[PDB]
Nucleic acid binder design. Structure first.
Length: 43
RNA sequence: CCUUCUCAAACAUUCUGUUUGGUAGUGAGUGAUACUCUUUGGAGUUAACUUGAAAUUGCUGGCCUUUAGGCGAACAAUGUUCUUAAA
């Protein structure tokens, strides 16, 4: 039926949720690093 | 649980020489000979000696600028501030 062969890449699964999770993880890591940095002045 | 001002000129050629400037210390304790000044209260100097980087309380020196600094610096000057020496 007059077709043309090609290669197709399927969409990655759960990319947006992974992106949001990574953004949240980065924010949490920054915040906890700040917490521990200013918590070490009372040693 | 840091690590100490390790040099600059000017003149002259005798593979170098002369001159000038640059150096603020652990504390405590013995100990004379002498000098200068003095507000006569002690202030600055002058041999030498002891020591685990030792230790049991010296009333408060003076002038200037303040809100601790200068006298070794006057329309001059003061650390708790760097944080990958992190966790």
């Amino acid at each position: 039926l007059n077709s043309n062969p090609e290669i197709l890449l399927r969409k990655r699964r759960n990319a947006d949720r992974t992106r949001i999770e990574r953004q949240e993880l980065a924010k949490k890591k920054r915040e906890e690093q700040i917490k521990k940095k200013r918590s070490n002045k009372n040693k």
